[PDB]
């Protein structure tokens, strides 16, 4: 009675582009080209696929199968698999909140860059502004110039001292207060995501039509533009030049594994929630396969979109694309790439479509990001929740706004780096490992292959059974161990992070997964009798 069965999706293509839109984001555009160029060039294509075939694809498909088969959220699905692991469903939730504290503020920047691109004269071209220093030296200016250690460019001046305003903070110690502009921008973003989620999967499935198709159009325009630019072959050469001596280093394999894990994004509850709303007899194999292969191809062409323009930028300056692409961060897009766009005809156009591209790159992923959590919470507290969906969705959007105020500060970029590298990363890898272990070694891989045999009509191949059993947990274990054995030394904008930064990162990291061990102890501490009877009723799913 009442609710009973759940709803289902409108069309196959909507979910195929929703998952693709979540998989494709900023990192596909700029993280993959940089990490591909500096780690062997074209030879990085070899382990990126291997780490995909053996690590990424099995977790992606296994997550999409569990989601489309059991049709439960990120929390309630563990009650039906391994109750002690129900804390997993909570951990991811907390994780999302950290991600949402900064990933949206970033989009805000693009938005603030987009709404400022309606002027006939772009702000970051001249130096006669109210924010530039005496070091500001620009082009369309006397030739012969020679750059000095203290000299800066109008683009670097514009990002550093105007929008980000990072000069008003001394580091993590003193960063307050909050910039009201980026607060209003991130409010507009939380509003364009509000009307795309509040109705459920219907609006995030209608908005995905745009959020997932626009970046390919914008990338196409920037691609055919940058390919026509003189000297664009240098960036492509630096992008594809095979350096087989890099493959001997054990680092590039870990880089490929991590890159294909976060790019594929299993283990986050997004694929679980998106897969939950679907037909029972619908095929799952082809869906997962196609989606991932697009996510990689899209990264591949995005590489050209970046390196043609950076090649042109190296030609206008003096070569070694590594010199012009040293900084691996938002500065590669907001400073380097932006300064390169400013020096092209119809600059207003390529700026609007560039920043708009960024926003549409971010939107689909924040849509899904929220979709998984909302689905999980509504399914764990049903009829105590679902009374309205708009109420919960609003409480989440607003919570993320107040959670982003730390990122909206003058020293917000510092918090962005700290949260992106020291907090969320190792925890998502951890919970992905815990999920992969629970589903593969607790629920049983044989029963999983039988469930897929019931849904899809055929049992998965030996290649996939052997991947879920052994290949995937070692795939995540390698990345986790590699990070924990040597955490990278953080540096951002001529500011080295204090030595205690990792403790804060680990503090934020540890406060996220206190629920799985305290919940294992909680449920393990609640069920009476002997510990063998409690763990036997706790590992085996509910009988009826």
């Amino acid at each position: 009675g009442s609710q009973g069965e759940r709803e289902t999706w409108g069309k196959k293509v909507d979910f195929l582009l929703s998952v693709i839109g979540y998989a494709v984001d900023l990192g596909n555009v700029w993280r993959f080209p940089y990490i591909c160029a500096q780690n062997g060039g074209g030879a990085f294509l070899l382990p990126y696929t291997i780490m995909a075939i053996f690590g990424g694809i099995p977790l992606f498909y296994m997550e999409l199968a569990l989601g489309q088969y059991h049709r439960n959220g990120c929390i309630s699905i563990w009650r039906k698999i391994c109750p002690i692991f129900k804390g997993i469903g909570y951990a991811i939730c907390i994780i999302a909140f950290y991600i949402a504290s900064y990933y949206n503020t970033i989009m805000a920047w693009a938005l603030y860059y987009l709404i400022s691109s309606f002027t006939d004269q772009l702000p970051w071209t001249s130096c006669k502004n109210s924010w530039n220093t005496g070091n500001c030296t620009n082009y369309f200016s006397e030739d012969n110039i020679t750059w000095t250690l203290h000299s800066t460019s109008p683009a670097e001046e514009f990002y550093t001292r105007h929008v980000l305003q990072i000069h008003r903070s001394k580091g993590l110690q003193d960063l307050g207060g909050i910039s009201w502009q980026l607060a209003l921008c991130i409010m507009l973003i939380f509003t364009v995501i509000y009307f795309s989620i509040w109705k459920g999967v219907k609006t995030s499935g209608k908005v995905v039509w745009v959020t997932a198709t626009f970046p390919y159009i914008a990338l196409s325009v920037l691609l055919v533009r940058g390919a026509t630019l003189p000297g664009a072959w240098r960036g492509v050469l630096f992008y594809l030049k095979p350096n087989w001596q890099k493959l001997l280093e054990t680092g590039v394999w870990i880089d490929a594994a991590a890159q294909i894990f976060f790019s594929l994004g299993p283990g986050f509850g997004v694929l679980l929630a998106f897969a939950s709303y679907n037909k029972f007899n619908n095929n799952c194999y082809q869906d997962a396969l196609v989606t991932s292969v697009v996510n990689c191809m899209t990264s591949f062409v995005s590489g050209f979109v970046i390196f043609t323009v950076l090649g042109y930028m190296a030609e206008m300056r003096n070569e070694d694309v590594s010199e012009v692409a040293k900084d691996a961060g938002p500065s590669l897009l907001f400073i380097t790439y932006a300064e390169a766009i400013a020096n092209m005809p119809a600059s207003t156009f390529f700026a609007i479509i560039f920043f708009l591209m960024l926003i549409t790159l971010g939107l689909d992923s924040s849509f899904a990001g929220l979709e998984g959590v909302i689905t999980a919470v509504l399914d764990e507290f049903p009829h105590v929740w679902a009374k309205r969906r708009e109420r919960f969705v609003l409480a989440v959007v607003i919570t993320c706004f107040f959670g982003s105020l730390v990122t909206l500060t003058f020293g917000g970029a510092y918090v962005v780096k700290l949260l992106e590298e020291y907090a969320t990363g190792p925890a998502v890898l951890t919970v992905a490992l815990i999920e992969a272990v629970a589903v593969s070694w607790f629920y049983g891989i044989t029963q999983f292959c039988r469930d897929v045999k019931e849904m899809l009509g055929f049992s998965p191949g030996w290649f996939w059974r052997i991947c879920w059993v052994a290949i995937s947990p070692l795939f995540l274990l390698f990345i986790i161990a590699s990070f924990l054995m040597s955490p990278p030394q953080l540096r951002l904008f001529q500011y080295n992070y204090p030595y205690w930064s990792i403790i804060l990162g680990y503090a934020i990291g540890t406060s996220s997964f206190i629920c799985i061990p305290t919940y294992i102890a909680y449920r393990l501490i609640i069920t009476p009798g002997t510990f063998k009877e409690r763990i036997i009723k706790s590992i085996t799913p509910e009988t009826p």
Epitope: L149, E315, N318, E319, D320, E323
Partner: antibody, heavy 119, light 108 residues
Framework: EVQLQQSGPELVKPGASVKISCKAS????????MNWVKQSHGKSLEWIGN????????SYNQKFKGKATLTVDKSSTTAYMELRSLTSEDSAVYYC????????????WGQGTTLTVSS | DIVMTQSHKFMSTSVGDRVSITCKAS??????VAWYQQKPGQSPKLLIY???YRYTGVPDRFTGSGSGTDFTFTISSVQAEDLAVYYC?????????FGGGTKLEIKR
């Protein structure tokens, strides 16, 4: 104007270490990269590495990694290059040369330092 | 790395002749070539930067040309005090490398 005064000749026994100085004047010291070029007897110039004077931001060459150590002192605007594990190949004339960031040319050089590594 | 190759280790010219030194690079350089002068017993002296541009305090008789991998340093009117060893050096990719050196001997 721009003057770079290095140290005098140095005669050091093989296996020991030697430090060469570089006093700069005539320009804003925190504005330009400080470099070290090794020139062997009858050979060509050989870029050792640079150092950022604001923070000591060193950038060595792969051929001199672990061979030369560049330091800098802002209190007196003076750069240093130290060479350890001296052999017969290190007996050469060493220069410290000013250079901007871009374009990376060596506008002003020192007079050189004749190093002789022999017992 | 980059290999700057000067084929002619020695070149003979006379006082007043037109002399040109060639410099061959490994890969494409665009216009990132500097020409240095090292007089016998003195420190190197910068003459040309970015293929063709002359530096401040250099007579007009010293020129530079080239765009790509092969570059040429040309002296129109050779003076008696122009006797020195000339070096070419790329300034785009790390590390910055130099040429072998061309000792310009004067014929009389």
């Amino acid at each position: 104007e721009v003057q770079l005064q290095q140290s005098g000749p140095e005669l050091v026994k093989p296996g020991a270490s030697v430090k060469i100085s570089c006093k700069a004047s005539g320009y804003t010291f925190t504005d330009y990269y400080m470099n070290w070029v090794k020139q062997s007897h009858g050979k060509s110039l050989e870029w050792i590495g640079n150092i950022n004077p604001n923070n000591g931001g060193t950038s060595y060459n792969q051929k001199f990694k672990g061979k030369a150590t560049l330091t800098v002192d802002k209190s007196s605007t003076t750069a240093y290059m130290e060479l350890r594990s001296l052999t017969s190949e290190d007996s050469a004339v060493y220069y410290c040369t000013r250079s901007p960031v871009r374009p990376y040319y060596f506008d002003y050089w020192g007079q050189g330092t004749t190093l002789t590594v022999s017992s | 790395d980059i290999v700057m190759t000067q084929s002619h280790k020695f070149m003979s010219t006379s006082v007043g002749d037109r002399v040109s030194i060639t410099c061959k690079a490994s890969q494409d350089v665009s216009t990132a070539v500097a020409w240095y002068q090292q007089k016998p017993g003195q420190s190197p002296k910068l003459l040309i930067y970015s293929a063709s541009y002359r530096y401040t305090g250099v007579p007009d008789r010293f020129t530079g040309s080239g765009s790509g991998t092969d570059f040429t340093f040309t002296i129109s009117s050779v003076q008696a005090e122009d006797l020195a060893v000339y070096y070419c050096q790329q300034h785009y990719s790390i590390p910055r490398t130099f040429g072998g050196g061309t000792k310009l001997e004067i014929k009389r």
